[PDB]
């Protein structure tokens, strides 16, 4: 039956134009196995690209725009082809113009083609598409404000390259509100593209905090569905790569009780996220590494150091030697660690395969060697008291045998603690 | 000190749920004796 559909919309008729677009329609939302390929081998697309022009009917324009949608959302070759037949423009006008049943069409269909890829991504805010999207976002429709967020997210999505900032930026004031919406798909999709943009420069990231985001951000990470939590919270891990200020304003947010609570999550990819955002804040300055402590992040941050999946273990121990860095400055850290029994688990991390690491967890033990060092010098005693727990936790076997390290650095930091604190 | 992320996650991908030394460079390298 398709041959003869190909000439029924070829006919000059308008009332014949509509019954073929009607039945090209139906036949490419067939559930199961869509004839996308056949339909678009017939030559029919760029027909159905004219039937979407401001010189057509409000019904015509609606059929023609949902079968290349239908043809839009299938293979990125499928895409490709509703693209090459120059479809956007027309998708992008058709927001301005038509009724909500067609706005909801090529929101969908736009959103499809910006996830393409980074190319298609640029192309569709090049067509200035970014200024009607947001008009939608007044329409007070639930199903189209929940499409709208879908389709924005995916102009922001993509790192190599970063989309042109000064465009994908004018979203922020809408999403800020829509980490706001009771609709959990229009929430979590809000929370990927703040996780896009909050990723980049501190000047992309400076952003976010001043649209007031990163307050309603920390609430978000108590949501019952990980499907919120999760780009929350990497939202919020993007925000404390900034700087000591930017830092403060998540801190001062509340987020530290959120993340003991994710450090208890059932994911494991939840908790590796944790671990990595709290070894950005011990990484930070000395009264957030004091707050970290204070929020009993150590405890559960040690635990899994000794017993959880060996990618959150490297984030844990990130997280606890960036802590010993302050140590050298307040002493009572070193020791609160220590005697939360991180000695243990530090040197047991020293034969994972991971160079990267190695030099962290040694840098951890000798800030922990260092004062306990200057611990017994300066009130004279004869023993150096973490030398001595990290000995009987067979740990300087462990260090030792870092001298057979193919790295340099790690051979020579090594070197140096066997020397200094096990002569 | 800070560290990005190894990868950006996004919602469509995103699923929750090494040599030794030579012996060119082992002799030519002074190993520091612990005591024991």
Request: hydrophobic share 40%.
């Given at each position: 039956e398709?041959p003869?559909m190909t000439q029924?919309?070829?006919?000059d008729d308008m009332?014949?134009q509509?019954?073929?677009?009607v039945?090209?329609?139906?036949?490419?939302?067939?559930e199961?196995?869509?004839?996308?390929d056949?339909?678009?081998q017939?030559?029919v697309?760029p027909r159905?690209?004219?039937?979407m022009?401001?010189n057509?009917?409000?019904?015509?324009?609606?059929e023609?725009?949902?079968?290349?949608?239908?043809?839009?959302?299938?293979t990125?070759?499928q895409?490709?082809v509703?693209?090459?037949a120059?479809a956007v423009?027309?998708?992008?006008?058709?927001?301005?113009?038509?009724?909500v049943?067609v706005?909801?069409?090529?929101?969908?269909?736009?959103?499809?083609?910006?996830?393409d890829?980074?190319?298609y991504?640029?192309?569709?805010?090049?067509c200035?598409?970014?200024?009607p999207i947001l008009?939608?976002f007044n329409?007070?429709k639930?199903?189209?404000?929940?499409?709208?967020?879908?389709?924005?997210?995916?102009?922001?999505?993509?790192?190599?390259?970063?989309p042109?900032?000064?465009?994908?930026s004018?979203?922020?004031?809408?999403?800020?509100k829509?980490?706001?919406?009771?609709?959990?798909?229009?929430?979590?999709?809000?929370?990927w593209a703040?996780?896009?943009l909050?990723?980049?420069?501190?000047?992309?990231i400076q952003?976010?905090?001043?649209?007031?985001?990163?307050?309603r951000?920390?609430?978000?990470?108590?949501?019952?569905?990980?499907?919120?939590?999760?780009?929350?919270?990497?939202?919020?891990?993007?925000?404390?790569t900034?700087?000591?200020?930017?830092?403060?304003?998540?801190?001062?947010?509340?987020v530290?009780?959120?993340?003991r609570?994710?450090?208890?999550?059932?994911?494991?990819?939840?908790?590796?996220?944790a671990?990595?955002?709290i070894?950005?804040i011990?990484?930070?300055?000395?009264?957030?590494?004091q707050?970290?402590?204070?929020?009993?992040?150590?405890?559960?941050?040690?635990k899994?150091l000794?017993?959880?999946?060996?990618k959150?273990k490297?984030?844990?121990?990130?997280?606890?030697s960036?802590?010993?860095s302050?140590?050298?400055?307040?002493?009572?850290?070193?020791?609160y660690?220590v005697?939360q029994?991180?000695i243990?688990?530090?040197?047991?991390?020293?034969?994972i395969?991971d160079?990267?690491?190695?030099?962290v967890?040694?840098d951890?033990?000798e800030?922990?060697?260092?004062?306990?060092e200057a611990?017994?010098?300066?009130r004279?005693?004869?023993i150096?008291?973490?030398?001595?727990?990290?000995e009987?936790?067979?740990?300087?076997?462990?260090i030792?045998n870092?001298?057979?390290?193919?790295?340099?650095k790690?051979?020579e930091?090594?070197?140096?603690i066997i020397?200094?604190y096990?002569? | 000190?800070?560290?990005?992320?190894?990868?950006q996650?996004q919602?469509?991908?995103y699923?929750?749920?090494?040599?030794?030394?030579?012996?060119?460079?082992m002799?030519r390298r002074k190993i520091?004796?612990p005591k024991?």
């Amino acid at each position: 039956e398709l041959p003869q559909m190909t000439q029924q919309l070829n006919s000059d008729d308008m009332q014949e134009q509509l019954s073929a677009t009607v039945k090209f329609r139906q036949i490419l939302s067939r559930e199961h196995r869509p004839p996308i390929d056949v339909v678009i081998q017939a030559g029919v697309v760029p027909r159905l690209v004219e039937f979407m022009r401001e010189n057509q009917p409000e019904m015509l324009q609606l059929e023609a725009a949902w079968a290349l949608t239908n043809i839009a959302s299938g293979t990125s070759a499928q895409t490709k082809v509703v693209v090459d037949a120059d479809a956007v423009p027309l998708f992008i006008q058709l927001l301005y113009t038509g009724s909500v049943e067609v706005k909801e069409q090529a929101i969908w269909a736009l959103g499809n083609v910006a996830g393409d890829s980074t190319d298609y991504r640029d192309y569709v805010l090049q067509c200035n598409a970014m200024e009607p999207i947001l008009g939608l976002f007044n329409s007070n429709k639930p199903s189209l404000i929940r499409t709208a967020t879908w389709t924005l997210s995916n102009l922001c999505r993509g790192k190599k390259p970063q989309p042109d900032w000064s465009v994908v930026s004018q979203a922020l004031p809408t999403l800020a509100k829509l980490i706001y919406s009771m609709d959990t798909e229009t929430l979590v999709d809000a929370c990927w593209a703040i996780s896009y943009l909050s990723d980049g420069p501190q000047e992309a990231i400076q952003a976010v905090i001043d649209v007031r985001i990163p307050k309603r951000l920390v609430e978000l990470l108590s949501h019952e569905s990980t499907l919120v939590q999760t780009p929350a919270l990497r939202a919020v891990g993007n925000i404390v790569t900034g700087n000591d200020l930017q830092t403060q304003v998540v801190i001062n947010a509340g987020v530290l009780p959120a993340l003991r609570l994710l450090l208890s999550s059932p994911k494991e990819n939840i908790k590796k996220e944790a671990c990595w955002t709290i070894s950005n804040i011990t990484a930070g300055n000395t009264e957030q590494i004091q707050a970290v402590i204070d929020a009993n992040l150590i405890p559960p941050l040690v635990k899994l150091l000794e017993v959880a999946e060996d990618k959150t273990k490297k984030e844990a121990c990130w997280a606890i030697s960036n802590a010993s860095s302050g140590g050298l400055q307040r002493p009572d850290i070193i020791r609160y660690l220590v005697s939360q029994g991180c000695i243990k688990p530090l040197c047991d991390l020293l034969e994972i395969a991971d160079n990267r690491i190695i030099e962290v967890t040694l840098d951890a033990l000798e800030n922990i060697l260092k004062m306990g060092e200057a611990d017994k010098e300066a009130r004279g005693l004869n023993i150096n008291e973490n030398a001595d727990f990290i000995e009987k936790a067979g740990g300087m076997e462990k260090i030792f045998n870092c001298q057979q390290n193919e790295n340099d650095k790690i051979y020579e930091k090594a070197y140096k603690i066997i020397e200094t604190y096990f002569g | 000190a800070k560290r990005v992320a190894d990868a950006q996650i996004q919602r469509e991908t995103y699923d929750s749920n090494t040599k030794v030394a030579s012996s060119a460079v082992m002799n030519r390298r002074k190993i520091a004796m612990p005591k024991r």
